[PDB]
Amino acid sequence: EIPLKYGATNEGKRQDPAMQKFRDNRLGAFIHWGLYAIPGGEWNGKVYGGAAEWLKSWAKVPADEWLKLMDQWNPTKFDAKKWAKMAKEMGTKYVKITTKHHEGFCLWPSKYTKYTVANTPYKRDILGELVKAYNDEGIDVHFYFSVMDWSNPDYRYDIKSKEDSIAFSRFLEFTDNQLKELATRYPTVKDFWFDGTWDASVKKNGWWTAHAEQMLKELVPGVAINSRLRADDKGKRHFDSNGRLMGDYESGYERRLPDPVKDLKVTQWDWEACMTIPENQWGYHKDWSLSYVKTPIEVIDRIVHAVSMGGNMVVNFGPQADGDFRPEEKAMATAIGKWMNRYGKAVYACDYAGFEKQDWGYYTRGKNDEVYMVVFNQPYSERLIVKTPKGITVEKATLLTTGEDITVVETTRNEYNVSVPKKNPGEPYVIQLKVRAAK
Ligand SMILES: *[C@@H]1[C@@H](O)[C@H](O)[C@H](O)[C@H](C)[C@H]1NC(C)=O
């Protein structure tokens, strides 16, 4: 047991109403919108295949020249009400918004820098408009914040001198000022999701990460804070040097979700996966033919997978410079919304069921102990294997959409064959189980 001043604060999962709401939401959208949407992955005639929001880095553009894109920031088609309607129709219960990305351009009129929406042709407080519009649709708003900031020369990647330590301290004050500004301007914020926190400078200032968490929690009652923010006394990130999760939930799994057999440890804490539609484009990229683009069923699979293991899932959008969404993203949102409207009782406010994974798909557990089978891979056997934990029996199976009764056959102790429906549903579908636990 290593003594730590700046390690974990929560003992197990938070169970206050704000955390329960964060968890029960389950399905979110991400918005990555900033100056990078203007070039859209192209600089000086070269299209770069790397993530579009990192174009400043790929094309080696100096800060002064990158930030002159503010002169072209004029999203004529932007309408916060339309963005919120799109999220509602998709079935998303919360939206995470890039307040400021690594480029340092702020989507709110910060009083602490000139690189903000106020100093563009458009002028308006985009962040504020979105907060209002989403909240008006009953959608929670979370703030993405990049600590790393390419626009501020006080940022340091590492601390190799007293001068660096002084400059970086000033940088951390500036960061605190922006954070407090966001928390006091937009008090309905429910979460702060940090990125750009991997550098040695931040790792050497674990105290600051703990302070930022505490500062925001005093300003915004019940706010959630992601693990990615946090480094302990030894520089260890996400989980402290004693293996304990820092912040309120684990933020990770952008590349690959937790394995449903080998990574059951994640059911012990709150967690959230965030996902791109292409392989690795968060901001707007003009050419989606450069990498694999996920289909709606592939995204739906990921969403259910997350919930089945006790986690949230957030689907990313990278709006066009004009303030509208590309057609592929409108199609995705509509497709997800259709399926969610039919089958969402197996997603919203659901959790890990504690059953052994089977090949046909995933289990999820509802708040009244409903066990939902979400079937993605239809067996030629016409039988869905259900192995129950000790003391649990399956009493009935019902097709969620129609209420039709589904045959259940016991094959051996604690194992059943659940029949597939009489008519193939032709899409991923749900069977709801009634289970009983012995005394
Ligand atoms: C951080 C940023 O570097 C990326 O551009 C993007 O904002 C994603 C969401 C985030 N990625 C990770 C691994 O933290």
Numbering used by the authors: 35 to 473
Task: Recite the paper's sentences.
The crystal structures of α-l-fucosidase from Bacteroides thetaiotaomicron in complex with compound 4 and 5 provide strong evidence for the covalent binding of cyclophellitol aziridine to active α-l-fucosidases and by this virtue the validity of the cyclophellitol aziridine design for activity-based profiling of retaining glycosidases that employ the Koshland double displacement mechanism. In order to minimize steric clashes, BtFuc2970 was subsequently incubated with 5. The complex has C–O bond lengths between the BtFuc2970 catalytic nucleophile and 5 of ca. 1.43 Å as would be expected for a C–O ester bond. As expected from the reduction in aglycon size, 5 is better ordered than 4 when bound to the bacterial enzyme and provides a clearer definition of the resulting conformation and interactions. Upon trans-diaxial opening of the acylaziridine the covalently bound and substituted cyclohexane adopts a slightly distorted 3H4 conformation (between 3H4 and 3S1); consistent with the expected catalytic itinerary. Whereas aziridines and epoxides that are annulated to cyclohexane rings preferably open in a trans-diaxial fashion through a chair-like transition state, reaction with the α-l-fucosidase nucleophile takes place at the aziridine carbon corresponding to the anomeric center of a substrate α-l-fucoside. This corresponds to ring opening to yield a skew boat, as is observed in the trapped enzyme active site in the co-crystal.
